[PDB]
Amino acid sequence: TLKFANNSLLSGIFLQEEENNESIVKILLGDITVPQQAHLITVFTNNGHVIVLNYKGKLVESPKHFKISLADEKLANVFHSEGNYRILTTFKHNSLQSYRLYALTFDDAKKQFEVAHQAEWHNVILSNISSNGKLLAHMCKDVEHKSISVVSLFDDSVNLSFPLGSILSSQTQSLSYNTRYVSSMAIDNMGQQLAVGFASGVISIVSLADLQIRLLKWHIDSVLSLSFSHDGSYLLSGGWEKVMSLWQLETNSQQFLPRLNGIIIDCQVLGPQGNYYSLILQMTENNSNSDYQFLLLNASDLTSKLSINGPLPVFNSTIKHIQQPISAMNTKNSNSITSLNHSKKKQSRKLIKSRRQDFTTNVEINPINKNLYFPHISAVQIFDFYKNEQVNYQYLTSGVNNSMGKVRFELNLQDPIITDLKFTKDGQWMITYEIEYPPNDLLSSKDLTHILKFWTKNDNETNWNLKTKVINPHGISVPITKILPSPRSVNNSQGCLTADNNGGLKFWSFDSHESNWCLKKISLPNFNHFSNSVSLAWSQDGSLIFHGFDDKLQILDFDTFKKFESLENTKTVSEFTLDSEIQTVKLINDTNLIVATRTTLNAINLLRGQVINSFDLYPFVNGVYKNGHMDRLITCDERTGNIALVINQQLTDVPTINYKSRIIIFDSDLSTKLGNFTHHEYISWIGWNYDTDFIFLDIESTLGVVGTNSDIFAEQLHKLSS
Amino acid sequence: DYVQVADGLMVNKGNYTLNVITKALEDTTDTSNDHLDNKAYTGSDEFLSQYKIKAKAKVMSIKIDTKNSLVIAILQNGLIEIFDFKLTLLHSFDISYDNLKYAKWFTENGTEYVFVLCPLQDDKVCYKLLELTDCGSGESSPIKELSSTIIEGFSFENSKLCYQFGKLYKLNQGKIYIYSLPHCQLQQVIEFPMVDKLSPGDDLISFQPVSVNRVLLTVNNVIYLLDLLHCSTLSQRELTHVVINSEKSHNSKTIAIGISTKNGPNPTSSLEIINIDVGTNTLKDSLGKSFQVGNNDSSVILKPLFDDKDINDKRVKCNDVSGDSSVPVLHCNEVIEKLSALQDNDITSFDDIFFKELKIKEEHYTEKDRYISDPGFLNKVLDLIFGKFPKTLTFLLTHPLFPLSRTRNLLSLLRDQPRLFKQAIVTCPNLPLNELLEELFSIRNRELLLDISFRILQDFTRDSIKQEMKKLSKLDVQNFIEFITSGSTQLFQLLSLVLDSIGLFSLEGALLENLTLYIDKQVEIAERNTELWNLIALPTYTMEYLDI
Amino acid sequence: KDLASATNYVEGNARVTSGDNFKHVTATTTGTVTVILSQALQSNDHSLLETVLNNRDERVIRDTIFRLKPALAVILLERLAERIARQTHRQGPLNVWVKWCLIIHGGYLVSIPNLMSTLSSLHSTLKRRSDLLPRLLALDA
Amino acid sequence: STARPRIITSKAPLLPQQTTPEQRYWRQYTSAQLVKEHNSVTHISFNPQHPHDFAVTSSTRVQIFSSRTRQVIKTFSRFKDVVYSASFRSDGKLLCAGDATGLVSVYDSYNPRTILLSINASTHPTHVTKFHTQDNKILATASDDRVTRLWDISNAYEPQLELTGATDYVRTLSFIPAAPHLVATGSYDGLIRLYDTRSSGSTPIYSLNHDQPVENVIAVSPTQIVSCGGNNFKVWDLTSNKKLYERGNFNKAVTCLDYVENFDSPMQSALIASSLDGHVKVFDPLDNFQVKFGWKFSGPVLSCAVSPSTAQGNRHLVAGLSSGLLAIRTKKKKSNNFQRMMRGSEYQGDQEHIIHNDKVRSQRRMRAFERNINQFKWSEALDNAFVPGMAKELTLTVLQELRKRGKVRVALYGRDESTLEPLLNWCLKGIEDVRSASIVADWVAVVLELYGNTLESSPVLQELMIDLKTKVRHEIHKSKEAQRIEGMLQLLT
RNA sequence: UGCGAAAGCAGUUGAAGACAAGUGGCUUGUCGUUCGUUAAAAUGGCCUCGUCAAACGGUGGAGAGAGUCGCUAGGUGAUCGUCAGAUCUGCCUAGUCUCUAUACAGCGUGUUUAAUUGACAUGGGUUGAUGCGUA
């Protein structure tokens, strides 16, 4: 793993608190500096740096990097063939880009690459390059409509062009715009045929010598990816169903691969004989982030050889120029053929003007094996961060999550949302709470279902088993604002405490006799006001519970489960009305407890029963987080302090799309800010793993942490026998 | 860190016994005992005794006399047992053992030769430790723990006469260096305000804490980590907490220096020589809910104002999320000075109090969130306007709009202005449900009935409404049913509450049939408008016409 | 199975429960049938419990429950609650029995300390019967 | 890529009185046989060793039945008066029977013609005869002489021990199952006496005061014994002389007990009890002798037994009634050239280095609605719902899968009069249940939303809508009156 | 779109430019165009890798089914009849009564708290649907 931020060699290329458009745009396998000698890769970035890096053994502490003499252009990609090298570049009327192709040379002065400028294309809509990189097709928009042009780049072997109205049918001109919008194109290694995949769902192989077309109709929603095999007789296609089809182009015969946990936004054959398929799966059940899974797979038995994925959190809001991909209709998982430009303008305006800029998530840590559990939409990604690779992925609700690739209308259905999950403190059970949503346009379309599930695994198996589920805990249609696992003194850490927005509480516990997790204790008040500013805390002794409802922190006992009482009235203060609705009641240890509400941050001792410290939060966290998310923004320890965490959206010379994070720690009842750290990007969740560290989740999901004769014969034989 | 604070020899018995505590006496002959009756014979008495114990038999009793040895007594039968002298200097604190648990021939002068609980059984001579001024016996693995004023700590185990550990403990003149409640530590009190817990397995301090106030007769209770302490010239025996299955409530320990405070149980009246009165009757230390009662040994409150995250180049604050301001200029000195600016000769006017408060807190005069305030400050300015001066139009409007008003709200029915009263119904954020139910059932037959039923429903739990609305007469509830039947949703569920809380049988019939007819037609109209809300091809021969 | 293949959802033999089972914390009257009912409830005799509560004359039910001993009205009510939970057409005839048990023994089961915990099955049955009332209101509208 | 998730059958929250594992196991004892005897069946014992035959003591004959045909294999009829007790020895080799003339006669089992020895016990009727359970050559007979006797079957002239001491009508023996010197006897004055046989034997070492006259005493552990008599049974720890459970869940007197251990069951131990009012009940000794299942019979049940712990075949529960009949409920249980050509097909990789396994497991067969939902034939899935032989939860789960999954309207588009009548005719039945009625509500609402003109045309679904209206009227009266009961006990908190 | 509670409470829906069609304009409609506002459809659907049979262990059940015109409570019909009421031994429903392989449903038995074994050469060829009636 060649870490960029590990060294100034190429973290000097990008470590900026504002500028991440410096991107890595191509990797080549050879050495562009010296030919004919390869175990090291040359990476071209999107600005013009060319870094040569050894990935065999330790990375060299001074790579062979250069910087090519480039204009304002921004490096679309590079291209290789036998010997020679091309590069392609993008430009500055109607918002279209403009492409320009150069050729490279290196040899005379070994610092610069000299360029040559073959040709230009002055308006480009869509582009693709063949598998060998020997030719490339693109679209034009030159008038009544667009146009399609193919050109060989490493030779003037062929360059043709035609208006695509001669591709399109006569039926499509009296039909919807999806029938003539094109979302994919591909060419084979000879330039004889070309695949145009349309947003209506069809594919059309044109034969480039005579412009005769052949229609392939299987995709019932938009075609998102096309590729040819090397001989050109098989076409891989992928779309909004999560099914990779491969079309035998002789008999037009599909072979499918149907449940690929993400829509195929790119697919291509990979090997010399074509023994691997590489795919990019967009995993669009969460609309708040574009989270791609990289999956190659061997073509023999179609098994996922080396699937690759980062951590998959679901933030409360959309993040940073995130556009859910194109489709046929404008849904809650996609957007139609018209609304991409308006949606990106609206999303930029929402990040600029608006006020509720909270995109924070809940992540949990399994207290047995220290891997963290990102609850995806209707599923969890179990992921360990000492090697940053996914343990597994598991569906925890009963939707149409896995059984079906949903398409044009059906994308307006959502699978149930996992909103809470907490482990019991010995890591033996996982409590999860989900909101099951009904489909629209029927009688029960406006009453949700609330399901609380209890899962178990032993310490070997990677996936959990449902032991029980309670549909509608706390009553029908009432949510669960907060679940809290219980300490090791109530039922040997096998109890949970769920809270309503009525202020009702239910204590559930697992008893072995009736071998199930059943409802032990109940305290329901029947108010007529509701608020989801509910928090909960427990004494480590297992004696008294701090029920932080809105504006009011009640103190209940555990034996009779009502409000605390001593008959002697030894100033038994069992309620703390504060200036605003409270969103954290985090008790650091059995002496005192930190309350956080939307104006101030108080701390209250109980061996000296009054307020000890207070802090000002309103200039920082005003109306920007939803009420109930400060609990995931701040956290604690079990000995060594408490962690607050604020966010400053940066400014120009109006706010911008850029952020910075100010995390601060306190020891021992808000005494000293002994940690004042600033991170270059928005921070979304922070939480204490159980061995005195605090992990946090960056908005671009980097998990960070705040912590405390014979010799020459041997050499030549290992050469000559390898 | 205290406990429930009140009350201003065999060590495991109680009452219903005869005398399982026979102890020595100050300024008397040697010793005595009493009942709630066992005989008081002699254990070869008339010496310089300072305490007295037994072999946990009460007929093998003794008088622990300062003569280097002790003999047995006959306090039940009449047959004595033989003895054997070891030393001849001072055995005033002799403690006879059980069946081979913890015994050695240590009298007073560094001669702790190990022996057994017998008159002729011997062991090694474990007199190796120096001159110890605090020698105690514990049950780690039954052990003599010596703390020496040659200052050094040592711990020998009288199970195989084996010196377990020892170090240099610099202990000064103590008050009570008593072993711990689970025996794992040594609670040694410093003279006036301190009690340090030291590790009594390694001779090192583990937690040196201060105490609350003056206390002299301190000893660990039969608790987890709790001690009892009586005042020096006081009968006040308080309890503090720094056995775990079904703990003790009385008869825990008898070491006190009060007005003859012998044999200290919870009800400690009938003493062994004293015949005194009794006190508190609680148990030992619980887990963590009694420390909300005994919240002592810390009384250091100041005026806590809201601080700010420290300005280390705060000019790069990056688009603050307020409306127009950035930070309120805090003036706590002006907050205190507004009291002097208000407590003046504006005895009936709002020219030097209301303008003063609204100048010190530049708000819209009915709104929160431009806070910088203290509850003691708001309580004292509310006291200064509850004095010589509700005729202010800004101060007592903007501060029932404050979530810290603190229970000076009881006269809100006792003063009756319409707009201030309705504003104190809606917005005053702590209200007594006694006064709320009185205002509810003292009906003026208006929309403030709806405004008071709203708050009584939306901030109190239904059973806490029911138990404290049992406290009503019957004319109130009969006129309430009559006014509901005469002439809405929250009062329907309030009617449900009054029917649940009047009780079962003691009703009348005509009011019940009137309410039955009224709610029958109420369910009929509710059903019909619920229905309203849930309610919101070619023949074979035609004949038609066309244009001519 | 593949390493990238997600785990499907499977309930298996998980116990699905609701949020409302609170199972954890001279003559001159008639010729009634209450000796039959009493020594149906002292044992667990479903057969002669069925032959005693297929009697559906209102005065017979009334003074039968009046002559019943109040220490076992709670278990008569438990048997009625479980039978109307299982068989849904019994709710018509059998809830005549359950309203008379509450009216007559209105003191015993208000002096019992845990009413909901002792007759949980009645509370869960009536909650699931009356919870869907807005839905079939909209249906019949 | 994954495999396709199976369609999960819609399970609701569980209703009260579910089927426990204990009552599922004890409910598969069925196919009752009723055999009319000449008189009341007083005792029934089982063969211990090949635990597959049982002896029923009627009046003046003892019949051994087989546990595979349930007919009388053999019968013992040469008694002069009413035979009372008949038990097998612990080796199962011979059979003792106490008779109303006080003549214990022991035959060998499976040979009624060879009476092996006739112990002439007391002149009073001998009411209980059983061999030792540890020892083989001693036989304990108690009689209506208020004295039990231990007989060595070699010296069958004088009893080798005479256990007296009881004041009235000793009717039961028992032996303690680890200490073989320990005989617990039970009489009609209460007072389970029990005797150490190395001592004098004319005095018990202690006595257990069951207050009612006991009918039976059995031994469960080596420590605890259970005595039934009167309306209850009590259990007694024997090392501490002390009662620790009592269950009185009957109407009349518990006549008999017996006990099972280690047999193939969810219940690891089981005590069943027979009680003169028709009932035989099974109690589980591990959770505090709580009752788990019961049978009701057509008269007062006088004696009962089950198959012993090692039955290995057809397993039996037998109960003999005082009416004079016997009720049995059982639970049951190409060429050499071609083979030389196809030899290897049973090898399974023993001496082989690497052993590869990728044969996938064959899952359960898909039903037609599940494969139609898989094939996206949504209207065909609705049609496959409304066949007659479908379970109610299966119709509910395919309705719920079409509701959550796609479109009710897609499933209902191409319909008319003849193809909607299955749906509405099921919705009549589904509107009654709580678990179905939400789905029935929205399906009926959608079908009247998009078939309001077929309502006008066809009169033969107008009447179906009217019947549905009266159904929802009955159900809304029920859902209103349930809320009234809910309020009227909310008043009583 | 904003505030919210899951109910609800306030706000809407402009402009420019280009192109297409229709009759240089005029009308209408679009936009891989911009600025401002907090703001339905191209006949087009999801892979093979082994099935079948018989058990067993937990989990649910509205039980899957068949009788007795046996009881309890009902809803209702044909013809005659002034009604009274007659015949249809009137029909249907629910509960009860009686019986069965718990018949029903689902998950699992590769290791699991628990619980599985067995058949078959898992091919090729010819008819097999125009050869069939019990209706």
The DSSP string of A600-654 is EEEEEESSS-SEEEEEE-TTTSSSSS-TT-HHHH-EE-SSS-EEEEEEEEEE---
Distance CA B250, CA C4 (A): 66
List C-alpha distances in Å: A461 to A363, A383, A390, A464, B327. Answer: 21, 14, 15, 8, 54
For residue B241, give the 3-state DSSP assignment. Answer: strand
CB B353 within 8 A of CB B345: no
CB D172 within 8 A of CB D163: no
Q: Would you call B531 and C107 a contact, using CB atoms and an 8 Å cutoff?
A: no
Q: What's D130's DSSP letter?
A: E
Q: How far is CA D279 from the centre of its chain?
A: 13
Distance CA D155, CA D152 (A): 5
CB B502 within 8 A of CB B508: no
**Positions of chain E reached by protein Cβ under 7 A:** 1-7, 19-20, 30-35, 37-47, 49-53, 55-65, 71-73, 94-102, 104-110, 112-114, 120-122
| Å between CA of D371 and C1' of E119 | 27
Q: Which of D153, D155, D175 is nearest to D163 (CA)?
A: D175
| Å between CA of D435 and C1' of E63 | 15
Q: Please name the member of B504, B505, B534 whose beta carbon is closest to the beta carbon of C137.
A: B534
Distance CA A544, CA A539 (A): 6
List C-alpha distances in Å: B537 to B540, B543, D412, D454, D456. Answer: 10, 16, 21, 11, 12
CB D83 within 8 A of CB D329: no
Q: Which of A346, A362, A289, A361 is nearest to A320 (CA)?
A: A289
For residue A159, give the 3-state DSSP assignment. Answer: strand
- SS (HEC) of A672-707: EEEEEEEECCCEEEEEEECCCEEEEEECCCCEEEEC
Q: What are phi and psi of D402, to 5 degrees?
A: -70, -25
Contacts of A509 (CB under 8 A, 6+ apart): A486, A490, A491, A494, A495, A496, A517, A518, A520
Distance CA D296, CA D277 (A): 9
Pairing of strands A600-605, A592-597: antiparallel
Distance CA A641, CA D340 (A): 78
CB A362 within 8 A of CB A348: no
Q: Would you call A395 and C9 a contact, using CB atoms and an 8 Å cutoff?
A: yes
Among chain D residues, the shortest Cα distance to A471 is held by D13
Q: How far is CA D477 from the centre of its chain?
A: 41
* DSSP string for D6-68: PPPP---SPPSS---HHHHHHHT-EEEEEEE-SS---EEEE-SSS--EEEEEETTEEEEEETT
* Residue B528 at interface with chain D, using a CB cutoff of 8 Å: no
Per-state percent for chain A, helix, strand, coil, to nearest 5: 5, 40, 55
Distance CA A275, CA A277 (A): 7
* Residue A400 at interface with chain C, using a CB cutoff of 8 Å: no
Q: What's A416's DSSP letter?
A: P
Q: Which of B343, B1, B182 is nearest to A591 (CA)?
A: B1
The label of the residue with tokens 């809270």 reads A499
Q: Please name the member of A542, A579, A609 whose beta carbon is closest to the beta carbon of B403.
A: A579
Alpha-carbon dihedral sign for residues A37, A43, A44, A50 = negative
Q: Please name the member of C106, C107, C141 whose beta carbon is closest to the beta carbon of B535.
A: C141
Q: Would you call D15 and C106 a contact, using CB atoms and an 8 Å cutoff?
A: no
Question: Which nucleotide is at minimal CA–C1' distance from A479?
Answer: E6
Pairing of strands A147-152, A135-139: antiparallel
Distance CA B137, CA B266 (A): 25
Q: Which of A161, A143, A142 is nearest to A151 (CA)?
A: A161
Distance CA B408, CA B484 (A): 32
What b-and-e string marks burial along A473-483, b requiring 16 or more CB atoms within 10 Å of the CB?
bbbbebbbbbb
Distance CA A593, CA A545 (A): 12
Distance CA B45, CA B66 (A): 9
H runs (alpha helix) in A76-142: none
Among chain B residues, the shortest Cα distance to A355 is held by B321
Q: Nearest-CA distance from B73 to chain A in Å?
A: 47
Q: Which of B459, B397, B238, C120 is nearest to A550 (CA)?
A: B459
Q: Which of A425, A418, A489, A426 is nearest to A450 (CA)?
A: A418
* Residue D359 at interface with chain A, using a CB cutoff of 8 Å: no
User: In chain C, what residues touch D14 (CB-CB under 8 Å)?
Assistant: 15-17
CB B161 within 8 A of CB B210: no
Among chain C residues, the shortest Cα distance to B527 is held by C137
Among chain A residues, the shortest Cα distance to D12 is held by A471
Q: Nearest-CA distance from A447 to chain B in Å?
A: 15
Distance CA D479, CA C131 (A): 8
| Å between CA of A372 and C1' of E110 | 28
| Beta bridge partners of residue A452, listed in sequence order | A433, A470
* Residue B369 at interface with chain A, using a CB cutoff of 8 Å: yes
CB D286 within 8 A of CB D292: no
Helix H or strand E encompassing A389: strand A389-395
Distance CA A547, CA A561 (A): 11
For residue A718, give the 3-state DSSP assignment. Answer: helix
| Beta bridge partners of residue A564, listed in sequence order | none
| Å between CA of D377 and C1' of E126 | 37
Q: Would you call A259 and D406 a contact, using CB atoms and an 8 Å cutoff?
A: no
Distance CA B315, CA A43 (A): 40
The label of the residue with tokens 């003892």 reads D62
Helix H or strand E encompassing C104: helix C91-104
A424 C-beta neighbours (distance < 10 Å), count:
23
The label of the residue with tokens 């206390």 reads B215
H runs (alpha helix) in B177-263: none
Q: Would you call A606 and B295 a contact, using CB atoms and an 8 Å cutoff?
A: yes
Burial (CB < 10 A; 0-12, 13-18, 19+), residue B341, is: middle
Cα atoms in the Cβ-side hemisphere of radius 13 Å centred on A42? 21
Residue D83 structure tokens: 């035979």
* Residue C141 at interface with chain A, using a CB cutoff of 8 Å: no
* DSSP string for B461-527: -HHHHHHHHSS--SHHHHHHHHHHHH--HHHHHHHHHHHHHH-SS---SHHHHHHHHHHHHHHHHHH
First to last CA, chain C: 51
CB A445 within 8 A of CB A439: yes
| Beta bridge partners of residue D34, listed in sequence order | D327
Distance CA A588, CA B524 (A): 56
Distance CA D253, CA D248 (A): 10
Residue A558 structure tokens: 């555990």
The label of the residue with tokens 């005797």 reads D195
Residue A16 structure tokens: 């900026």
First to last CA, chain D: 56
D246 C-beta neighbours (distance < 10 Å), count:
14
Torsion of CA B314, B320, B322, B324, to 10 degrees: 80
Residue B456 structure tokens: 């009584």
CB D31 within 8 A of CB D73: no
List the Cα angle D301/D306/D308 in 5-degree steps.
155
Q: Which of A360, A370, A381, A254 is nearest to A311 (CA)?
A: A381
- Interface probe for B, chosen from A556, A570, A658 (most Cβ of B below 10 Å), is A570
Helices D421-430 and D437-450: crossing angle, nearest 10°?
150
Contacts of A349 (CB under 8 A, 6+ apart): none
Distance CA D484, CA D493 (A): 15
Given resolution (angstroms)? 3.2
**C-alpha Rg value of chain A to the nearest Å:** 30
Region for residue D44 given its phi and psi (left: phi exceeds 0; alpha: psi -120 to 50; beta: otherwise) = beta
Distance CA A40, CA C100 (A): 88
State the amino acid at position D443 in one-letter form. Answer: W
For residue D295, give the 3-state DSSP assignment. Answer: strand
Q: Nearest-CA distance from C141 to chain B in Å?
A: 6
Q: What are phi and psi of B456, to 5 degrees?
A: -65, -20
Torsion of CA A397, A400, A405, A409, to 10 degrees: -120
B251 C-beta neighbours (distance < 10 Å), count:
21
Pairing of strands A379-384, A389-395: antiparallel
Q: Would you call A579 and B318 a contact, using CB atoms and an 8 Å cutoff?
A: no
Contacts of A297 (CB under 8 A, 6+ apart): A276, A277, A279, A303, A304, A305, A307
Q: Which of D261, D281, D257, D279 is nearest to D270 (CA)?
A: D261
Helix H or strand E encompassing B358: helix B354-360
The residues in B 471-530 lying below 8 A from C, measured between CB atoms, are 504-505, 530
State the amino acid at position A338 in one-letter form. Answer: T
Q: Nearest-CA distance from C126 to chain D in Å?
A: 5
* Residue B492 at interface with chain A, using a CB cutoff of 8 Å: no
Question: Which nucleotide is at minimal CA–C1' distance from A95?
Answer: E33
| Å between CA of A481 and C1' of E42 | 49
- Tell me which chains share at least 3 CB pairs under 8 Å with chain C: A, B, D
Question: Which nucleotide is at minimal CA–C1' distance from D9?
Answer: E106
The Cα diameter of chain B in Å comes to 152
Residue B22 structure tokens: 């026979």
- Tell me which chains share at least 3 CB pairs under 8 Å with chain B: A, C, D
User: In chain A, what residues touch C23 (CB-CB under 8 Å)?
Assistant: 518-519
Q: Which of A661, A658, A668, A663 is nearest to A687 (CA)?
A: A663
Distance CA A556, CA A549 (A): 12
Contacts of A8 (CB under 8 A, 6+ apart): none
* DSSP string for B423-462: HHHHS-S---HHHHHHHHSS---STHHHHHHHHHHHSS-H
List C-alpha distances in Å: A481 to A430, A474, A536, A593, D460. Answer: 17, 11, 10, 20, 50
- Interface probe for B, chosen from C137, C139, C140 (most Cβ of B below 10 Å), is C137
CB D103 within 8 A of CB D119: yes
Q: What's A60's DSSP letter?
A: P
Distance CA A419, CA A314 (A): 10
Q: Would you call A577 and B319 a contact, using CB atoms and an 8 Å cutoff?
A: no
Q: Nearest-CA distance from A440 to chain B in Å?
A: 17
User: In chain C, what residues touch D438 (CB-CB under 8 Å)?
Assistant: 132, 135
- Tell me which chains share at least 3 CB pairs under 8 Å with chain D: A, B, C
Q: How far is CA B378 from the centre of its chain?
A: 28
Distance CA A26, CA A22 (A): 13
Burial (CB < 10 A; 0-12, 13-18, 19+), residue A720, is: exposed
Q: Which of A183, A194, A188, A206 is nearest to A125 (CA)?
A: A183
A→D interface, C-beta within 8 Å: 257-261, 302, 304, 395, 398-400, 402-404, 409-410, 413, 439, 441-444, 470-471, 513
The residues in C 2-21 lying below 8 A from A, measured between CB atoms, are 2-12, 14-21
The label of the residue with tokens 């959770």 reads D287
Pairing of strands C15-18, A465-471: parallel
Residue D81 structure tokens: 């008066």
Helices D437-450 and D392-405: crossing angle, nearest 10°?
60
CB D227 within 8 A of CB D208: yes
What b-and-e string marks burial along B30-50, b requiring 16 or more CB atoms within 10 Å of the CB?
bbbbbeeebbbbbbbbebebe
Distance CA B524, CA B521 (A): 5
For residue A277, give the 3-state DSSP assignment. Answer: strand
Q: What's C7's DSSP letter?
A: B
